[PDB]
Design a protein around this ligand. Structure first.
Ligand SMILES: CC(C)[C@H](NS(=O)(=O)CCc1ccccc1)P(=O)(O)C[C@H](C(=O)O)c1cccc(CN)c1
Ligand SMILES: [Zn+2]
Length: 304
């Protein structure tokens, strides 16, 4: 049984992806872009008014298994899109002019693991050689200054960068989809928790992005928009200095491919509850995050 105000297990999220597609068959289509190490289907939703060669915004949730408010947000976002499309000017224009690619859970194997054995698991669940330790950090597994800084070469560590860039089937699947659609994808948004930040490149080096000016200004505006609702305070900036260095991230990789609007969101809270954010806070967190996402969508649309 699914709720937008509770955390749902994978079986339920998987059924939800099929359910929401069947109820909105002319607004939403569903695809599997690959399978996890354990063989689960990695689903991607395409949301928008059907039309030839539209630009798109790409958003994923659930890179990291324990960051449950991330998964909850992609679901919240899709419902908001559907509920307001057709009679809210902004969202109606949004889905008229572009598509959203929503990947509700990337790291499905880990998510199941956090529901069944260890709530605090982070990584994938693939096997490693030379050690009994399991898993690779998906946000260390992309071809962006891979394993050069901010990652561990130790497979027992939480930031293990993997056997090689895109060693993980999940990261390969995501990377492969985006490569094929680099033409249409105009923005990349990846949702994490916690610590209340908006990050943009770079994380694999203290080097600043070409349009560092444009991105810093957009993030500043986004966090101001988000705080309007509940006063929630976000910080923002290039990844390496705003949080810490972390090579192999999907946002840096997205930006180096030609996606000049690439952001990582870190949602509530700032550590009081951390990854175990109370379900009573799901709605508030999602509502305010929507304001930032919509602000970014409006901008990308305008400068498209
Ligand atoms: C709480 C939140 C800040 C997460 N950090 S974490 O779970 O403590 C990372 C694991 C860890 C734990 C202890 C010591 C070293 C690493 P995150 O996992 O969502 C941060 C994210 C990452 O580490 O992949 C991150 C950090 C820096 C830059 C970017 C943008 N690519 C993204
Ligand atoms: Zn994370």
């Amino acid at each position: 049984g699914h709720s937008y105000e509770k955390y749902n297990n994978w079986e339920t999220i998987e059924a939800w992806t099929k359910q929401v597609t069947s109820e909105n068959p002319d607004l939403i289509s569903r695809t599997a872009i690959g399978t996890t190490f354990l063989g689960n289907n990695i689903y991607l939703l395409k949301v928008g008014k059907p039309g030839p060669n539209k630009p798109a915004i790409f958003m994923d949730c659930g890179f990291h298994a324990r960051e449950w408010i991330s998964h909850a947000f992609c679901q919240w976002f899709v419902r908001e899109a559907v509920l307001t499309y057709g009679y809210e000017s902004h969202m109606t224009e949004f889905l008229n002019k572009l598509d959203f690619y929503v990947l509700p859970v990337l790291n499905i194997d880990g998510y199941i693991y956090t529901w069944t054995k260890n709530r605090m698991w982070r990584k994938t669940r693939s096997t490693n050689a030379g050690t009994t330790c399991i898993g690779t950090d998906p946000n260390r597994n992309f071809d962006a200054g891979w394993c050069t800084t901010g990652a561990s070469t130790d497979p027992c560590d939480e930031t293990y960068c993997g056997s090689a860039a895109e060693s993980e089937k999940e990261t390969k699947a995501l990377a492969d989809f985006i490569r094929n659609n680099l033409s249409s994808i105009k923005a990349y948004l990846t949702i994490h928790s916690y610590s209340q930040m908006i990050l943009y490149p770079y994380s694999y080096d203290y080097k600043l992005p070409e349009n560092n000016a444009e991105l810093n200004n957009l993030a500043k505006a986004a966090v101001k928009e988000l705080a309007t609702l509940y006063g929630t305070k976000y910080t923002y900036g290039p990844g390496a200095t705003t949080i810490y260095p972390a090579a192999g991230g999907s946002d840096d990789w997205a930006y180096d491919q030609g996606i000049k609007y690439s952001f990582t969101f870190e949602l509530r809270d700032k550590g009081r509850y951390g990854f175990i954010l109370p379900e009573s806070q799901i709605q508030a967190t999602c509502e305010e995050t929507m304001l930032a996402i919509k602000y970014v969508t409006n901008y990308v649309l305008g400068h498209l």
